[PDB]
């Protein structure tokens, strides 16, 4: 997500008018923030990928 810079000044008529000018201005500094971690489940390994991984482990011996 592109970052939101702090509210410069409370007040919508003046401060937010120049806050849209700043954040949305053609020339701006779009810093990045990460989203909060979503609870990813582990991907199931396909059987052929397990006959590829197992063949190296057998090559250990």
């Amino acid at each position: 997500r592109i970052a939101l810079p702090a509210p410069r000044g409370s007040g919508t008529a003046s401060d937010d008018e120049f806050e849209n000018l700043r954040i949305k201005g053609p020339n701006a500094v779009q810093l990045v923030k990460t989203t909060p971690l979503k609870p990813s489940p582990l991907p199931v390994i396909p059987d052929t990928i397990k006959e590829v991984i197992y063949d190296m482990l057998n090559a250990l011996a």
Partner: protein
């Protein structure tokens, strides 16, 4: 150990070998889709923030 190269470094090697100059072009093509989406969400969140301030 930190000596083991990260996926990004292996992909970097792959990219170099398979496309030295076309990587920048793909970054530009994908950028066109990412920045537009993230700016849409930035403007929606910003509106939400102004709204919450007004309701405050």
């Amino acid at each position: 150990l930190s000596s083991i190269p990260t996926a990004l470094t292996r992909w970097t090697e792959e990219c170099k070998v398979l496309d030295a100059e076309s990587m920048h072009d793909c970054v530009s093509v994908v950028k066109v889709s990412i920045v537009n989406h993230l700016e849409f969400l930035r403007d929606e969140e910003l509106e939400e923030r102004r709204e919450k301030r007004r309701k405050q």
